[model samples]
Target chain A: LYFQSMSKQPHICVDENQVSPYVIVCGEPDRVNRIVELMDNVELLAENREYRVFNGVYKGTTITICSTGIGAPSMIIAVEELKLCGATHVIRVGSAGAMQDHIQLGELIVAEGAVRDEGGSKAYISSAYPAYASFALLKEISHFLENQSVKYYFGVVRSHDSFYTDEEDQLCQYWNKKGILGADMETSALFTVGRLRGLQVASILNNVVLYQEGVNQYVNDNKAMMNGERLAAITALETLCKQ
Target chain B: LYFQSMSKQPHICVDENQVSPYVIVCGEPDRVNRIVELMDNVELLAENREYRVFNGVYKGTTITICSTGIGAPSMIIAVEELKLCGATHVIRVGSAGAMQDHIQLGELIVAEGAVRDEGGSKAYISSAYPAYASFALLKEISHFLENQSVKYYFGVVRSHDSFYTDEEDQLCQYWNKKGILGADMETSALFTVGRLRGLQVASILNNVVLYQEGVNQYVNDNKAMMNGERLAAITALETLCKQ
Candidate 1:
């Protein structure tokens, strides 16, 4: 990148030279800092509203971690910058709410695909086109988790923008009856944008809210929250090194 | 309002008595403080997350001021609590991007109604329902701005949660060609929810970016920004007092 053209990304505050090809992202800046600790040698790359960036050695490879606030809209912006700045493979490590009775809070849900109930993805492609993870990356991440014997579920989740919507119960129940596994804010946008950009996108979402917990009630289980964050971070990192 | 059974609202951290029936809201906490200063006697109230709550007096009427963060999702939460607590009339004073070429920066767009390109309102009623501001409240705001001889447009504006959508230019131009005045984020949700809750709602959005500006280039003119903020804030407060 030419020096004159290398100004930092508007929202994330990073240039091409400040990033790596392998990136792991989450919804909260606090989560970004925690995931960055999963690596060996690390340095904070840039910090700006809602997005915090850092790069480090995860196993034998360099990896970047970023935070992309809540909702599909916010996540799409971060993903765009990550792709433009040289991130070829992006994995989202975050939390979700179980949508089915069989899924347990605190367990991992590797989103193989998502229901594009959000608007950001539809801005690019028709809803007829699926929003799904690249299998090779998912396969790589799965094997790493399998070798570690960490428990995780692979299934479809519904992605929506508003957590406080009035139809949340009805819509969530409809998805549950349709056999959806979980619900989250950003996975569909990540999968869709990554598909368009040709950046391999995969997400491992830990269930922080139970299906029975109803609306807006994230579990108060800090231990479960902390454990799942670490498990998924390492699961994504192992795949990062392999790639 | 009942004594709330003594449970604080989750996001705003306030109960009924801490709020006033006449309230003004903004998208940013910093803007909230500036709007709060327009009142005579002010006392900071409960605050949490992106919301900064305070109650004050402007021209013989007690009023509240709140910061609602960015989109409809977060703003709806603040509005919900404001309703659940004590507010009956809510006026949003914030910035908009001019959608029509005839408009100038720093001028106001009093959203009479908005294009509901957002999902938050759909969670309540069907998309067929209009997201119209309460007529009596808008009449008050319009009359107040008229006496001041302020440059304000009264028309429909486009409201969407995502500013970075791929179809942004197309959607904006579509609305602009369709005679929309500006582009904003939370007005539809405010009007939609206000209608459902029987709470009066109005918004006066100042154009901080001009029609010709591309995505994300807010006119960094502090003079224009400050002037619009103050003009719209007082315009809302003056009408708020009459009620």
Candidate 2:
């Protein structure tokens, strides 16, 4: 109740009362809106910069969906603000570029942990610190994916601050050698902030692009991207309801 | 000629031939303009996103000034692109919040090393890796700072991704106890990227604000902020030319 009495946060511009304890997060504003549309009795809570928040109910459980923009810097702010506004759990639903050759396009990647290849979380703790998903959430997600017979890869993903340099150029060779399954911009921030703030956090990413022969190519299969994203979203909602 | 043949970088949108070997970097676009105005034969290289590149000559030495916007993520991109474009020596000139009681407002802080409180550097190397200024550049900057009679503190500064949470609220208490002299957003990334890419990098910051008693307060005196910023800019330029 004390959290609910507070005013809007400086960055997110939304108060505790405007959000739910269970939250679904994404990098794009439209993605957040899409996730919210899947629920019942949705209400637009706030829209400021890239942080657009919505509150709704799924399977009789209250849920909030928020957009965290693109990189670790943006994700850290949204996560920190959302945590202050009563978010106890956060599930990042976003798209990623496949790093490994075996990980095909349009497959879902559940991040068990993220290589701290991004800069946002380092300010909160030492880089020696690991960015791991909440074990409970990971297990629950795995169970749900299994029960639904969903095609998903559970592995370590790399979260980078730069799309071109880290993901597309400079460190791609190194990360590809490191056997990282996929790459996204926000997972490390989510995991790090979740651990620091004592919240449950996990990321579900849909691999839409691949790095091959020094170039990034989008999967020719549009249906795969759509299916992967939809499945990840539905799985996140189900996971939240279970909690 | 090799640099001239490359296309414009994806993020900075500046080609290799457009930049010089020595570069002055800052977070604000106006600061890039300010630095360029102090030079001779200024030419606008490119303006894309937050990166505003300007090429000019300082004391017969070719130099480039580029803006990296706010945080490590942004800085890493600018530094990487600039390096590809032929930047060998880069110095970050910006304003910071004093973290220690002894660091008075308007005082210059030469970052000999940075507490990797920001995540951008970790993407390049392990958190255990120290973000130290290039030894030659540090010595040169120290010499110039002394020669110019600038009142400066040579110590470790903290680089954070979140301005409010890391610098103002969440980790402020922890950082205050960690002996960090001040806080900025990009130094760690600059230093780390410099080491990785074989470039000379350093940061000279002016403390313009302080966190005290659960609130962030700007220096009561504005002259200090202006003087400190000007001094930092001049010092960075002089140091770059010396190399």
Candidate 3:
């Protein structure tokens, strides 16, 4: 009822600066709750399919949490409405399938930029504007992760439209041959949205699945939901908000 | 009748090793006949919307010429289907809009590589893979134009999706800010298709419009459609094929 009230339209969802200015966005509703639970004072703000939003205080700073689900379409809506509702900074916290063999499973990646392989961002801007994480946000995340002694790879991520077809061997081989770090579902959209809105946006993804390695780490691994890498993401976001 | 037959399906266009190895690609169907008029021996091979396929001998080298319409989608399908029909080397000879302030109208640009700001290429491979011009073909075009004393920008060209929206203020600001040499609609898709099919591809574009200067030079220009750059392009391709 609260979610339906908060977001009256299917595409419009808004919240009025209830949580920290630094938001940790994820793709799962349960993950949004998990992030909020780690905050000091948490409150359930709104809930909807793949659009769960929450408010909370983390390390003396108020932050907003929202789930963007998957793909560029939903991600664009989430970013736009979040900006409309007073989100100053957004850091996507999610998992990805590693594209390079060197990047092992359970590792975290701090995306420096993304190859805009998706549709939603292109509807708004040209592809020449490199989909990049804000340098300031990258600095903050790196500082926090370093302070916490977390391991991460800071490189370019390929943001694709079709996870099934685009990541097929023929295309993945091309990406691998081109020296891209890995494949993730959402960062390019987030990066493009952030650049357009003038908000700092970044992503820290846990390598849950290895595409080039031929391993499906997330499949049938119930414990994969609360794995160490996931905890590292939570800690990194907490440290970011504190600073 | 032959044009109607080929118009029903695009896959029967050309085969380099099988039918004819030399091809001079243009952007319009009427161009096929005009280009053929310059050759000693010419024959209409195929004709479809914006695609006029012809077999001719330019400077004693047997050649095939075809049109690639306006955007990358049509260009990609043509390149792919043509390669399946055995086209080994392809050259996109067409008009373009200048993004660089220094390039004059009707001048030629021999592309070094293209920024894949367009979508058609992304369907086949990640944008991270650089869209490079075939070195041998690039050398041929460069050598052919070196004495022509044509003003050109040998650097990067922006490959875009939407002609207006893709070149929006933000994109213009970004690419201009980065000092991209020029902008065109179809080279990125052409290069990517060539790469995927393991064929050689190159493009020689005449600056027909200028977004940076805010002028449409192709508008009062009556000479643009009458095989303006076809001879220059054919000379380059014919030289490359002989090698």
Candidate 4:
């Protein structure tokens, strides 16, 4: 019956207004609290399975953050609930394992778009839309990072369903052949959900790890890079709010 | 393990060779013998909840027909067992409702590819490869139909996971807008399994029913056109085996 008054179904226990207009989301709950700590006036809004919502002031703008567990099934619930809770924009801030050789450890990578290498996006929309970042958000992030002199690249990232399998081999190879920059989870689902609901969404990756030529290296385990990238993303979100 | 060898799983209760290769997979078993009656050398191979396997021949091609029950979850099992029993070429001969205005009542459709709109495909591979028809087999069917002056369309069909709610309103609209020709329950799963195991696969449809612009149709009733389409398809398959 709660859905009767809502445009979409909110998550089981979260309040509607707890989600802010400008929000950063990730897959881990700890990351949500960490992002809240960086904000000026922070408060925990809601806590549910892999979805810990927080709201706070960032550079005079109100922002929210939530953790969206691992796959599309969970991501769909996150997007729907976040929407019903009055969140207008979403930015998936997470770590990615870089696929390209040029992208080194500890660098930032912004997703221009993502290839639907999973089932979640298909559940929402067709393949023709091709999950893409909001051009305005992409431009703002690019400009901000350039000003900060942070090393980065803008290209396609693959969103996969499984963490490990021989079946994923062909998909990885196909995307690699098509020049996908790296792989991660959640973003494509977010983008597709955003598109379906008429919301602006983008993803900013803290490319702290690499899965390359049969090798992998996390750029820097230092909390500073992770925090720096998170700050960079929030600053970008703040700039967009002002715009 | 039974999977490593040719052993059938204990509860299934069937002989391996009797499992049948020329399968006319539908979603229900009540229709299995009816489908089998349309073939020469027809006999019940196996029958369970939704899977009913029948052995038969079409123009001397030793074949087996089966019901895939409903949706991708059950149908995936049918495909795996059939392949393990040495089905080299598998064709899904089933019914569907056309989504496009160009696809009229009782029209036959051969799926050249499928949009991975179900969980079965995702359970195996990534979304990059898509569910495509075996090109040689597709071409063979297409050529045969063209020479016979059969009315049909060759392109992408949507393989879905739900029988009632999956393609209902917005989801059906989404697919139709993206040029999906028809809606069926199992091809995407079949194609994914086929590609993963290196077997040849295709789906030919008998569009037996029609849906109005925004309203759904009942699947149990047989339309006049569907009967004609089935007869035509049977002839087509018979002619195809001769080559």
Query: What is each candidate's DockQ, to 2 decimals?
Result: 0.26, 0.20, 0.05, 0.03
Pairwise DockQ winner, candidates 2 and 4: 2
**Candidate 1's residue-wise lDDT over A1-243, tens digit each?**
233223788667887887889999987677777887777888998865567789889767999899876667668878888888888999999889998876666689999999998766776777888899998898997787777654688889988766665667788878888989998878998999888888999999988877983223333465667888889898889888998
Native contacts kept (model 2):
0.38
Could you list the chain B TM-scores for each candidate? 0.92, 0.90, 0.84, 0.82
Candidate 3 regions with alpha-carbon error over 4 angstroms: A1-12, A17-20, A148-150, A212-225, B1-243
Report the CAPRI category for model 4: incorrect
**Higher TM-score: candidate 2 or 4?**
2
Model 4 stretches astray by more than 4 angstroms: A1-12, A213-232, B1-243
Clashing pairs in 1: none
lDDT of 1 at B216: 33
lDDT tens digits by residue: candidate 4, A75-190: 66677767767777778887777777777655776788898765667765576768989887777777777776557778899876544345556665676678888887668878
Model 3 lDDT tens row, B153-233: 565677888867644878776776565667788987887767667677777777776655234644545355334465456
Per-residue CA lDDT of candidate 3, range A1-243, in tens? Answer: 777665543543455534345677887778876776677777777676788877777667777778888888888888887777666788888877777887756677777667788888778765644576654566666666666544577766788778676448887887776656777778888977675676777788887766641256445343553564466557556656655
Residue B63, candidate 1: Cα error in Å is 4.4
Q: Predicted candidate 2: interface RMSD? A: 7.5
In order of appearance, the predictions have TM-scores of: 0.84, 0.64, 0.50, 0.50
Off by over 4 Å in 2: A1-74, A112-155, A158-180, A195-198, A208-243, B1-10, B27-74, B115-131, B134-151, B158-180, B208-243
Sort all candidates by DockQ, best to worst.
1, 2, 3, 4
Worst 10 residues of 3 chain A by lDDT: A213-222
- Candidate 2 at residue A222, lDDT? 60
